[PDB]
């Protein structure tokens, strides 16, 4: 695993990792955090039916 980071990185609001290759991401329209689709359990197909995504934290 690489040491250090990319200063121009986006971190998943759930797992806290960087973006990798061929990953599906989704953004909360309220807090504007990004999430691995795998981490919030949303597929591209499902996300197609989502008008405005609201993350678990904002949904409380």
């Amino acid at each position: 695993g690489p040491l250090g980071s990319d200063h121009g990185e986006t971190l998943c609001g759930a797992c806290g990792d960087s973006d990798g290759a061929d990953e599906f991401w989704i953004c909360c329209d309220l807090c504007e955090k990004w999430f691995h689709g795998k981490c919030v359990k949303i597929t591209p197909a499902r996300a197609e039916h989502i008008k405005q995504y609201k993350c678990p934290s904002c949904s409380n």
């Binding site: 290759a21 061929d22 990953e23 599906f24 989704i26 953004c27 329209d29 996300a47 995504y53």
Partner: peptide, 9 residues
């Protein structure tokens, strides 16, 4: 929703 798919290697 605001989504994105990253590229391959």
């Amino acid at each position: 929703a605001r989504t994105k798919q990253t590229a391959r290697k």
